[PDB]
Structure 1
Amino acid sequence: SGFRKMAFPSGKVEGCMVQVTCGTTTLNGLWLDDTVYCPRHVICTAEDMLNPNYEDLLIRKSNHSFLVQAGNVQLRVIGHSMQNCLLRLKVDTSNPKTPKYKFVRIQPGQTFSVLACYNGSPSGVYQCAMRPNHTIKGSFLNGSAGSVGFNIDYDCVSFCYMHHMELPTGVHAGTDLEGKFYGPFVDRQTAQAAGTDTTITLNVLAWLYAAVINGDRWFLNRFTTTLNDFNLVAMKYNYEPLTQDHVDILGPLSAQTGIAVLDMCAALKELLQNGMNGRTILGSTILEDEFTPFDVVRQCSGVTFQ
């Protein structure tokens, strides 16, 4: 019984992947019901990207200007239309494998499963988090745009992200399924760059509990800090604000390990004092920011004595 950075079974999402090829551009598209979603820049060429006018461009393209194929059999496009940075294509046969779904907009800190695909087929699946700077540290290559990110709540695929491009530092930016980017990022070829990404406090703590849970509290002390004595030390360091909503959330882990969020945060200010080796924390010389409370709670189901 150990911690693992897991992902939801990509099974359901795969039954929604297809290949959308336009011109000399081929990427991916999510096929839900009689609709097929793909990043709109599919209808562009390296040149168009310098100053794309998607509205006018898309106009120069009809229903069978987009060759979509579910596996080896191609689908019939019965109408095209634009929605922000996506492209809603209609089809003659709604997806018979469409599962209970829904579109959400994840926030920074939150995690999700990404099913990378190429030419409409799956390569692998991995987990990751929507960093505080609105970027993602996924693993994408050309032909990867069009891939989705999700979370499955009891037989329900909550789609939250759809890949597009890759930033200067090797990180990734994409949009929600409605078609709006997760940042100040525009899908055109202009000078852009990820803003200085910090660290997720809430998950750095979840990690901290997972640690205690599984052993080691050398980073613990009778040290008690206020809800404003930690947050000052916060902006100094990369770690973000520990709102009152994080407190509550850290509640369940709190009650379990018998430790108080305040005394936990206080244990952290002493890590921004060193926190070197000597005993480390589950190996990691640093601090894991992409393991959410829910995740730790999830894995390693412990009890709470009352």
Structure 2
Amino acid sequence: SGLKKMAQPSGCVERCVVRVCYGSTVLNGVWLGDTVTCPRHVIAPSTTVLIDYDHAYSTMRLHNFSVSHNGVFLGVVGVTMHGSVLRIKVSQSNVHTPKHVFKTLKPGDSFNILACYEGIASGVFGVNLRTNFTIKGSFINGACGSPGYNVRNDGTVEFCYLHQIELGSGAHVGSDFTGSVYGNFDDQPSLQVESANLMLSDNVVAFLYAALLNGCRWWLCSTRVNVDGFNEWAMANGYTSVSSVECYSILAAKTGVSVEQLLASIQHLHEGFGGKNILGYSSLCDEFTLAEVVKQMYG
């Protein structure tokens, strides 16, 4: 038993992480086959003033790149630019390239971040793409290029994020591997401001089912609210809508509690726990998806 926000194992991805240097700027990239993807601001002349990327790419020279994996140098043969990333073609193919795919995340998807500095993984953690297209991570100077990923049941890695920016709020933004920045933020120093985050209602429901199944039941109200009424309340109170109730049928059956009862319980619990807790959390938790709760409780 227990519920803990965890990352999927990082080995297959650590083998793809490299150090990318242009001039005196250092950040990370990801080496899959004979291509290294990294953020394009590695060739920026400054990163404090507004950047003409067209100019920086046109005047870029290959002899200024140095790309290495655990100190072993890779030979750069060429570079193309795709939105906010570079694809650096190199001589050597990564023999530890895992079976993989590129995937673009949607709000509410969970994934894993491998935080890297100078080409070396430092830390690994699970996170959710928020409704405002940011994440709440922990990154300092040098982290750009840290990858995000999921690993499917068949062993296939979905590469889905590369760290790009920290907004003024402290919230974090990346791009996918096509170079689209999540939420169309700009990979520029700017005064951009994210929308206010919405609590992910589907996760909050999953979490309350997990609480029931771990014998924590004090918070359960005996009121019912239907989907359309919860969704109206949600808009007013900083919560997403809830997805089809059929998703939860296995857990509804195992607990004998319907989604509608949990929705009403959320409405009440939003006002405060009154000093009590739920699986140790002193307020509602949207950190875990349905899939994560099910995987952690049952495999």
Q: TM-score, normalised by structure 1?
A: 0.93
Q: Secondary structure at the match of 1:270?
A: helix
Q: CA deviation at 1:224?
A: 2.1
Matches within 5 A, 1:27-46: 27-46=27-46
Report the alpha carbon displacement of residue 4 of structure 1 after superposing the two structures with TM: 1.4
Amino acid at match of 1:254: A
Partner of 1:185: 185
Give the partner amino acid of 1:70.
H
Aligned to 2:80: 81
Q: Measure the CA separation in 1 of the matches of 2:254 and 2:31.
A: 42
Query: 2:105 maps to which residue?
Result: 106
- Contact residue 270 and residue 284 of structure 2 kept, 8 A: no
Q: Is 1:272 aligned with 2:270?
A: yes
SS of aligned partner of 1:281: coil
Q: Deviations over 1:71-120 (max 9, x none)?
A: 21111111110100000110111110100111111111221111111100
1:136 aligns to what?
135
Aligned to 2:203: 203
Q: Is 1:62–1:79's contact at 8 Å kept on the other side of the alignment? A: no
Shift of 1:145: 0.3
- The 1-side partners of 2:75 and 2:7 are apart by 33
The answer to whether the 8 Å contact 1:162/1:174 transfers is yes
Question: Equivalent of 1:289, from 286, 290, 296?
Answer: 286
For 1:132-156, what per-residue CA distance to the aligned partner results, in whole angstroms no more than 9, with x for missing partners? 1111111101110000111111311
How big is the shift at 1:295?
Answer: 0.6
2:257 aligns with one of 253, 256, 259 = 259
Any residues of structure 2 matched to 1:229-248 within 5 Å, and which? 229-244=229-244, 247-248=245-246
* Cα distance between partner residues in 1 of 2:247 and 2:66: 46
Distance (whole Å) between structure 2 residues aligned to residue 27 and residue 242 of structure 1: 39
Q: Once the 2 structures are TM-superposed, how far is the Cα of residue 285 of structure 1 from its aligned partner? A: 1.4
Tell whether the 8 Å contact from 2:151 to 2:158 is kept in structure 1 after alignment: yes
Letter in 2 for 1:299: Q
Partner Cα distance (2:272, 2:91) in 1? 62
Write the distance in 2 (CA, Å) between the matches of 1:201 and 1:89: 41
Could you tell me how far apart the structure 2 residues matched to 1:90 and 1:238 are?
45
Aligned to 1:146: 145
Q: What is residue 4 of structure 1 aligned with on the other side?
A: 4
Which residue number corresponds to residue 214 of structure 1? 214
The number of aligned residues is 298
Give the drift of 1:273. Answer: 4.2
In the alignment, the residues of structure 2 paired with residue 61 and residue 274 of structure 1 have an alpha-carbon distance, to the nearest angstrom, of 55
Alpha-carbon shift at residue 186 of structure 1 (Å): 0.3
1:6, 1:126 within 8 Å by CA — same for their partners in 2?
Answer: yes
User: 2:20 matched to which residue of 1?
Assistant: 20
Gaps of 5+ in 1: none
**Unaligned ranges ≥5, structure 2:** none
- Whether the 8 Å contact between 2:272 and 2:283 is mirrored in structure 1 is no
Letter in 1 for 2:132: N
Q: Which residue of 1 aligns with 2:298?
A: 301
Task: Answer whether contact 1:133 1:194 (CA < 8 A) is retained.
Answer: yes
What's the CA shift for 1:275? 3.3
In 2: Cα distance, 1:81 partner to 1:3 partner: 43
**Contact 1:100 1:155 (C-alpha < 8 Å) held by counterparts:** yes
Aligned-partner SS, 2:3: coil
Secondary structure of 1:88's aligned partner: strand
2-side partners of 1:76 and 1:200: how far apart? 45
Structure 2: how far apart are the matches of 1:70 and 1:269?
Answer: 51
Task: Report the Cα distance in structure 1 between the residues aligned to 2:246 and 2:140, rounded to whole angstroms.
Answer: 39
CA deviations 1:142-171 (Å, max 9, x no partner) are: 110000111111311111111011111222
Cα contact 2:108–2:131 (8 A) shared by 1: yes
Letter in 1 for 2:287: E
Give TM-score scaled by structure 2 length.
Answer: 0.95
Cα RMSD over matched residues? 1.6
Counterpart code for 2:188: R
Taking every aligned residue pair, what percent have the same amino acid on both sides? Answer: 43
The residue aligned with 1:226 is 226
Q: Does the 8 Å CA contact 1:17/1:31 hold for their aligned counterparts?
A: yes
CA distance in 2, matches of 1:51, 1:62: 21
Q: What's the CA shift for 1:58? A: 0.8
